[PDB]
Structure 1
Amino acid sequence: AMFEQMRANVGKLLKGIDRYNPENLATLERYVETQAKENAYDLEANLAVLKLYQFNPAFFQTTVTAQILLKALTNLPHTDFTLCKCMIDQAHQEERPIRQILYLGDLLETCHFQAFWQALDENMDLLEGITGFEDSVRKFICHVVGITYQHIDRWLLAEMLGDLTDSQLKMWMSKYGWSADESGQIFICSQEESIKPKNIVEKIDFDSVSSIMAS
């Protein structure tokens, strides 16, 4: 619960002149790991460390930027991961573990979820070491499936989530209230509830157009 004990402190740090001052990296780089480990997030604190690393490239630390990058990818399809590469130098995108984390990040924004779980190397204990990261990306997979699909095959949803078993899939099936159709597919969303198209000749404008033409 060290996340809750730094919110007030780091909140006034990042609104002052201490976000251009490189000396504050002590409390800030600590608070970046406190997001990753304790499963919390703060973009302002990440983005300030990224900007202080873009100011002096020497103070760049690989694992602290991985703790930024991995937790940026849990928060998709937001531009958190967009602002990461903006600040990370040409030299600094070719580091370890950064190069592998960035490549895995490319697969998520292009929604190549079967390639994502294939691409994983399982010997990098840092990717095991982020708490709730393995489920967060799965919750983002199922998040986009609800927005973009009406029906999905039981085998297809499994494979997107890293080739799940019958029992492991029971969590993800229960999560958004999904169910199995007659001898076949999972039901994700109703057809008319997914699409919500825009309209021709809505023509509500007379309630203002008549009032400007009044005199």
Structure 2
Amino acid sequence: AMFEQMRANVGKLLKGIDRYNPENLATLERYVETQAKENAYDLEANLAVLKLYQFNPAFFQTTVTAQILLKALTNLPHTDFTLCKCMIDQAHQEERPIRQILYLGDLLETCHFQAFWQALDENMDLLEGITGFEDSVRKFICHVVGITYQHIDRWLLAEMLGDLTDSQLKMWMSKYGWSADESGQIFICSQEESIKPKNIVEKIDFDSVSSIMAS
């Protein structure tokens, strides 16, 4: 619970002149790991460390940027991960573990979820070391499933989530209330509920137009 004990402090740090002072990296780089480990997030603290790393490339630290990058990818499809590459130098995108983390990140944006879980190397203990990261990406998979599927097959939804078993899939089935259908797909959304058109309907703007044309 060190996240909660730094929120007030780091909040006033990042609104002052201490976000272009490199000396504050002590409390800030610590607070970046506090996001990753304790499963919390703060974009501004990340982005300020990224900005201070962009200022002096020497102070760049690989793991601290991985703790930024990995937790940026949990928060998709937001432009958190967009802002990461914007501050990470040409030199610094070819580091370890950065290069592998960035490549894995590319797969999530283009939504190649099958390729994402294939691409994983399982000997990098840092990717095991981020708490709730393995489920977070799965929750983002299922998040975009709801937006752009009306149904999905049982084998298909398994494979996207890293080739899940029958019992492992029970969590993800129950999560958004999804349930089986006849022969034999998993329901995701109603057909009229997914589409949501807001197309042709206007020319009802009479009231304003007559209020201005009143005199």
Q: Same fold (TM over 0.5)?
A: yes
Partner of 2:86, secondary structure, is helix
Give me the whole-angstrom Cα distance separating, in 2, the residues matched to 1:21 and 1:102: 27
State the match for 1:29 in structure 2.
Answer: 29
Cα deviation code 1:40-98 (max 9, x no counterpart): 00000000000000000000000000000000000000000000000000000000000
Deviation at 1:201, TM superposition (A): 3.9
Give me the whole-angstrom Cα distance separating, in 2, the residues matched to 1:136 and 1:54: 28
State the match for 2:92 in structure 1.
Answer: 92
For structure 2, the residue ranges without an aligned partner over 5 or more in a row are none
Give me the whole-angstrom Cα distance separating, in 1, the residues matched to 2:26 and 2:141: 35
Deviation at 1:203, TM superposition (A): 1.8
Give me the whole-angstrom Cα distance separating, in 1, the residues matched to 2:95 and 2:201: 55
Deviation at 1:200, TM superposition (A): 1.4
Deviation at 1:115, TM superposition (A): 0.1
Cα deviation code 1:129-151 (max 9, x no counterpart): 00000000000000000000001
Deviation at 1:199, TM superposition (A): 2.3
Q: Which moved more, 1:198-207 or 1:187-196?
A: 198-207
Give me the whole-angstrom Cα distance separating, in 1, the residues matched to 2:201 and 2:66: 50
Q: Which moved more, 1:198-207 or 1:29-38?
A: 198-207
**TM-score normalized by the length of structure 1:** 0.99
**TM-score normalized by the length of structure 2:** 0.99
Deviation at 1:163, TM superposition (A): 0.0
Q: Which moved more, 1:16-25 or 1:198-207?
A: 198-207
Deviation at 1:183, TM superposition (A): 2.5
Give me the whole-angstrom Cα distance separating, in 1, the residues matched to 2:116 and 2:12: 38
For structure 1, the residue ranges without an aligned partner over 5 or more in a row are none
- Which 4+ stretches in 1 moved above 3 angstroms? none
Percent identical residues:
100
Deviation at 1:36, TM superposition (A): 0.0
Deviation at 1:197, TM superposition (A): 1.1
Deviation at 1:202, TM superposition (A): 2.2
How many residues are treated as equivalent by the alignment? 215
Partner of 2:156, secondary structure, is helix
